[PDB]
C-alpha cells in the first residue's frame, strides 16, 4: 500500500508536476491561483507516505486520493479496470484520471500516418477495441457533474 | 475553518 504510493511519488515527482511543500488541499488549490486550468498532487502530511490531487473548475476545487487494494492501486474500490495487470504501476493507472495518458506527443519525426485531404474517414487512432473509459468530475451529493481535466503543471 | 480542508468525494464512480 504505502510502498505503492511512495514508489509513485518518486516517478511522479521526477516529472516536476509534483510540488511538495504546501498543505493537503491547499497544495492542489494553489494550481488555481497560479497554473489556472492545471491540477497538481501534494504529499499528504503525517508519515508523508500518501499524496492527494485536486483540480480547478467552475464548480469548485476537489481533491482525491488513491486507494491501495491488497496489491493493486485504484482511486476507488471497484475492480472495474483490471485491463492492466495486478500490482501494475500504482498511481500511474490513477494518473489517467488525474490527467491524460503518458506517451509524449513526439514520435520519431516523420508522420507515420498523414491526415491531408481525406474525407469520410473514421477518426480512430489509439482505439483498437480498448477503452477503460476515464473522466474526473465532482458529484452534486446526488447529481454527477462530469468535468474533463487533462493539463499538466509546468512550474511557475 | 482552520483544520479540515482536504475534503472531497470521488470521480466517475462506475457508469
From Swiss-Prot, chain A:
Domain SH2 intervals: 17-113
**Cysteine disulfide partners in this protein:** none
Tissue specificity comment = Low expression in lung, spleen and thymus. Expressed in Th2 but not TH1 cells.
* Free-text comment on this protein's domains from its UniProt entry: The ESS and SH2 domains are required for JAK phosphotyrosine binding. Further interaction with the KIR domain is necessary for signal and kinase inhibition. The SOCS box domain mediates the interaction with the Elongin BC complex, an adapter module in different E3 ubiquitin ligase complexes.
Renumbered to this chain, region (Extended SH2 subdomain (ESS)) spans: 5-16
- Keyword check for Cell inner membrane, yes or no: no
Instruction: Give the span(s) annotated as Disordered.
Output: 102-131
Q: Does the keyword Phosphoprotein apply?
A: yes
User: In UniProt terms, what is the effect of altering residue 1 to R?
Assistant: No effect on LIF-induced signal transduction suppression
Q: What is this protein called?
A: Suppressor of cytokine signaling 3
Q: Name one GO cellular component term.
A: cytoplasmic side of plasma membrane
What is its quaternary makeup? Interacts with multiple activated proteins of the tyrosine kinase signaling pathway including IGF1 receptor, insulin receptor and JAK2. Binding to JAK2 is mediated through the KIR and SH2 domains to a phosphorylated tyrosine residue within the JAK2 JH1 domain. Binds specific activated tyrosine residues of the leptin, EPO, IL12, GSCF and gp130 receptors. Interaction with CSNK1E stabilizes SOCS3 protein. Component of the probable ECS(SOCS3) E3 ubiquitin-protein ligase complex which contains CUL5, RNF7/RBX2, elongin BC complex and SOCS3. Interacts with CUL5, RNF7, ELOB and ELOC.
Amino acid at each position: 500500500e504505502y510502498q505503492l504510493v511512495v514508489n509513485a511519488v518518486r516517478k511522479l515527482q521526477e516529472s516536476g508536476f509534483y510540488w511538495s511543500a504546501v498543505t493537503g488541499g491547499e497544495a492542489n488549490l494553489l494550481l488555481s491561483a497560479e497554473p489556472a486550468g492545471t491540477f497538481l498532487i501534494r504529499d499528504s502530511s503525517d508519515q508523508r507516505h500518501f499524496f492527494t490531487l485536486s483540480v480547478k473548475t467552475q464548480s469548485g476545487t476537489k481533491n482525491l486520493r488513491i486507494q491501495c487494494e491488497g496489491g493493486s492501486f485504484s482511486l476507488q474500490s471497484d475492480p472495474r479496470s483490471t485491463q492492466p495487470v495486478p500490482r501494475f504501476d500504482c498511481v500511474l493507472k490513477l494518473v489517467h484520471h488525474y490527467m491524460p495518458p503518458p506517451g509524449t506527443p513526439s514520435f520519431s519525426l516523420p508522420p507515420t500516418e498523414p491526415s491531408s485531404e481525406v474525407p469520410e474517414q473514421p477518426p480512430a487512432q489509439a482505439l483498437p477495441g480498448s477503452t477503460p473509459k476515464r473522466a474526473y468530475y465532482i458529484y452534486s451529493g446526488g447529481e454527477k457533474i462530469p468535468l474533463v481535466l487533462s493539463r499538466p503543471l509546468s512550474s511557475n | 475553518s482552520t483544520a479540515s480542508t482536504v475534503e472531497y468525494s470521488t470521480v466517475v464512480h462506475s457508469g
